[PDB]
């Protein structure tokens, strides 16, 4: 039915500091997608009420 | 006669990746020069036909 597929799990890292006055920075990223299942005969599987 | 002098011989390296979406990049560089031997009057050592 309604299912999800994760591309890359949620990870985090720090942009490294080069000089002595480089500001602190951190980055979080994530990737996934969604789809509701249809059959071969064209039978939908989710109902949204109004 | 015709000779060459190599400044730096052919080397390669990779630009390092900082973030998680930094593109991959590589650089190759090289340095040398050429000279045909001569003398004081204008006597030469190479002939180019037509």
The CA distances from residue B32 to B4, B5, B16, in Å, are 7, 6, 27
Q: Which helix (H) or strand (E) holds A10?
A: strand A2-14
* B19·A15 Cβ contact <8 A: yes
- Which value, in Å, is the radius of gyration of the alpha carbons in chain B? 21
DSSP state of B27: E
User: Which chain B residues are Cβ-neighbours of A31 within 8 angstroms?
Assistant: none
* H helix runs in B1-50, sequence order: none
Nearest CA in chain A to B21: A29
* A29·B20 Cβ contact <8 A: yes
Technique behind the model: cryo-EM
CA-nearest of A25, A33, A45 to A4 is A33
Report the b/e string of A10-45 with b at 16+ CB within 10 A: eeeeeeeeeeeeeeeeeeeeeeeeeeeeeeeeeeee
Give the torsion through C-alpha atoms of B31, B37, B39, B45, to 10 deg: -150
């Amino acid at each position: 039915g309604l299912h999800a597929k994760i591309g890359m799990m949620m990870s985090s890292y720090q942009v490294p500091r080069v000089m002595h006055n480089d500001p602190y920075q951190f980055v979080k990223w994530f990737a996934a997608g969604f789809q509701s299942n249809n059959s071969f005969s064209g039978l939908k599987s989710t109902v949204y009420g109004s």
